[PDB]
Amino acid sequence: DPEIELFVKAGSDGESIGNCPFCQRLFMILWLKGVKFNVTTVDMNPPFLVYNKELKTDFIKIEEFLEQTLAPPRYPHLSPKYKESFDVGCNLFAKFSAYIKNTQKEANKNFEKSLLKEFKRLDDYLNTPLLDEIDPDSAEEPPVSRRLFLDGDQLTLADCSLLPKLNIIKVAAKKYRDFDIPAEFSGVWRYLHNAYAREEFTHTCPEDKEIENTYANVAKQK
């Protein structure tokens, strides 16, 4: 295979994995490709990629590049089967971003509700059986989805995008707003339990502190 170096943002010691959810997304893509690569952290905007001596910089170009040039059969395809696997998480980070930046405590419930509404949209998607889901015993569509991840039972590009952002939301909102993702979002929790069991996700996460540091001067209410 090719010679690859991924440059990611460094954490507060200038060495550890810092909070950069697109860097984690690319780290996941390369890991899931099953390709050799090195990861370098930068105490400097990341991620950047060196692929056979060429510097690449535009994330979208990079993601397209990798999916197209690291292809089957040597490498797994990572594009999701269903376009909505991508589309479901579209406003979730923005709602979190407004919630975590709000400094008016009496507005907290309104911003939290707006975040919960997006989590509900995600939960519904994760509970709705995909068109390809067939119960192995009855051959009926299951009544509630059982698939591991967004698109099916493998990690896809959808998950490499969404998972890093959900980790940030989970960590930062718990730290600064005492927020827990409701237990009643059983679809969301099944997905998170499955994801946190995969090392491509957990071992590319920065330490929670790095994410807490990102929000330390925005999330304190006044």
165 lines the binding site for ligand MNB (CB under 6 A)? yes
Q: Is 203 annotated as a binding residue?
A: yes
Q: Which stretch binds ligand MNB (CB under 6 A): 33-41, 64-72, 84-92, 141-149?
A: 84-92
Question: By three-state DSSP, how is residue 144 classified?
Answer: coil
For the bound state, the minimum distance from the C-beta of residue 90 to ligand MNB, rounded and expressed in Å, comes to 4
Tell me if 120 sits within 8 A of 185, measured CB to CB: yes
Non-local CB neighbours of 13 within 8 Å, separated by 6+ positions? none
First to last CA, the chain: 53
If binding is defined by CB under 6 A, does position 162 make contact with ligand MNB? Answer: yes
The count of residues interacting with ligand MNB (CB under 6 A) is 7
* Residue found under tokens 């950069």: 20
Is 193 among the annotated ligand-binding positions? no
Q: Minimum Å distance from CB 89 to ligand MNB?
A: 4
Verify binding: residue 89, ligand MNB, rule CB under 6 A.
yes
Which residues on adjacent β-strands are paired with residue 50? 5, 55
Among 19, 24, 41, 161, binds ligand MNB (CB under 6 A): 161
DSSP state of 17: B
Instruction: Categorise residue 199: left if φ over 0, alpha if ψ from -120 to 50, beta otherwise.
Output: alpha
Binding site for ligand MNB (CB under 6 A): 86, 89-90, 93, 161-162, 165
